[PDB]
Amino acid sequence: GEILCNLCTGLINTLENLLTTKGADKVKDYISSLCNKASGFIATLCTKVLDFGIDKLIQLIEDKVDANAICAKIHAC
Protein backbone atom coordinates (compact mmCIF):
# COMPACT_ATOMS: atom_id res chain seq x y z
CA GLY A 1 0.00 0.00 0.00
CA GLU A 2 1.50 3.26 1.21
CA ILE A 3 -0.59 5.25 -1.24
CA LEU A 4 -1.61 8.22 0.87
CA CYS A 5 -1.41 6.96 4.44
CA ASN A 6 0.73 9.85 5.63
CA LEU A 7 -2.34 11.82 4.62
CA CYS A 8 -4.82 9.74 6.58
CA THR A 9 -2.73 8.62 9.54
CA GLY A 10 -1.52 12.20 9.33
CA LEU A 11 -4.98 13.69 9.61
CA ILE A 12 -6.12 11.07 12.10
CA ASN A 13 -3.50 12.24 14.57
CA THR A 14 -4.88 15.71 13.91
CA LEU A 15 -8.32 14.47 14.87
CA GLU A 16 -6.84 13.76 18.28
CA ASN A 17 -6.13 17.46 18.66
CA LEU A 18 -8.73 18.62 16.18
CA LEU A 19 -11.80 19.11 18.35
CA THR A 20 -12.30 15.99 20.43
CA THR A 21 -14.28 18.31 22.67
CA LYS A 22 -16.21 20.80 20.57
CA GLY A 23 -18.43 18.20 18.96
CA ALA A 24 -16.43 16.34 16.33
CA ASP A 25 -18.50 17.81 13.52
CA LYS A 26 -15.65 19.83 12.06
CA VAL A 27 -13.90 16.48 11.87
CA LYS A 28 -16.08 15.20 9.06
CA ASP A 29 -15.95 18.73 7.69
CA TYR A 30 -12.17 18.67 7.47
CA ILE A 31 -11.91 14.97 6.74
CA SER A 32 -14.14 15.57 3.74
CA SER A 33 -11.98 18.31 2.26
CA LEU A 34 -8.99 16.04 2.69
CA CYS A 35 -10.74 12.86 1.61
CA ASN A 36 -11.98 15.09 -1.19
CA LYS A 37 -8.85 14.29 -3.15
CA ALA A 38 -9.21 10.65 -4.11
CA SER A 39 -11.28 9.91 -7.20
CA GLY A 40 -8.88 7.10 -8.00
CA PHE A 41 -7.20 4.12 -6.39
CA ILE A 42 -8.16 5.65 -3.07
CA ALA A 43 -11.69 6.06 -4.38
CA THR A 44 -12.78 3.00 -2.43
CA LEU A 45 -10.39 4.12 0.29
CA CYS A 46 -12.30 7.36 0.68
CA THR A 47 -15.71 5.72 0.68
CA LYS A 48 -14.08 3.25 3.03
CA VAL A 49 -13.84 5.72 5.90
CA LEU A 50 -17.35 6.93 5.16
CA ASP A 51 -18.61 3.36 5.03
CA PHE A 52 -16.82 2.83 8.33
CA GLY A 53 -17.71 6.10 10.01
CA ILE A 54 -15.47 9.13 10.43
CA ASP A 55 -16.77 9.20 13.99
CA LYS A 56 -15.83 5.55 14.31
CA LEU A 57 -12.22 6.15 13.36
CA ILE A 58 -12.22 8.71 16.14
CA GLN A 59 -13.93 6.21 18.41
CA LEU A 60 -11.17 3.66 17.88
CA ILE A 61 -8.57 6.23 18.89
CA GLU A 62 -10.56 6.98 22.02
CA ASP A 63 -9.98 3.35 22.91
CA LYS A 64 -6.36 2.85 21.90
CA VAL A 65 -6.24 2.61 18.13
CA ASP A 66 -3.30 4.51 16.68
CA ALA A 67 -3.72 6.52 13.50
CA ASN A 68 -2.26 3.63 11.53
CA ALA A 69 -4.17 0.75 13.06
CA ILE A 70 -7.22 2.91 12.45
CA CYS A 71 -6.13 3.51 8.88
CA ALA A 72 -4.93 0.04 7.98
CA LYS A 73 -8.34 -0.88 9.33
CA ILE A 74 -10.34 0.51 6.43
CA HIS A 75 -7.29 -0.58 4.47
CA ALA A 76 -5.47 2.62 3.61
CA CYS A 77 -1.95 1.24 3.84
Range of the domain at 24: 1-77
Query: What CATH code is carried by the domain that includes residue 10?
Result: 1.10.225.10
Q: Among candidates 40, 60, 17, 62, which has minimal Cα distance to 72?
A: 60
Contact assessment for residue 68 and residue 11, using Cβ atoms and an 8 Å cutoff: no
Contact assessment for residue 57 and residue 49, using Cβ atoms and an 8 Å cutoff: yes
Q: How many domains does the chain have?
A: 1
What does the alpha-carbon distance between residue 45 and residue 64 come to, in Å, rounded to a whole number? 22
Q: What kind of experiment solved this structure?
A: NMR
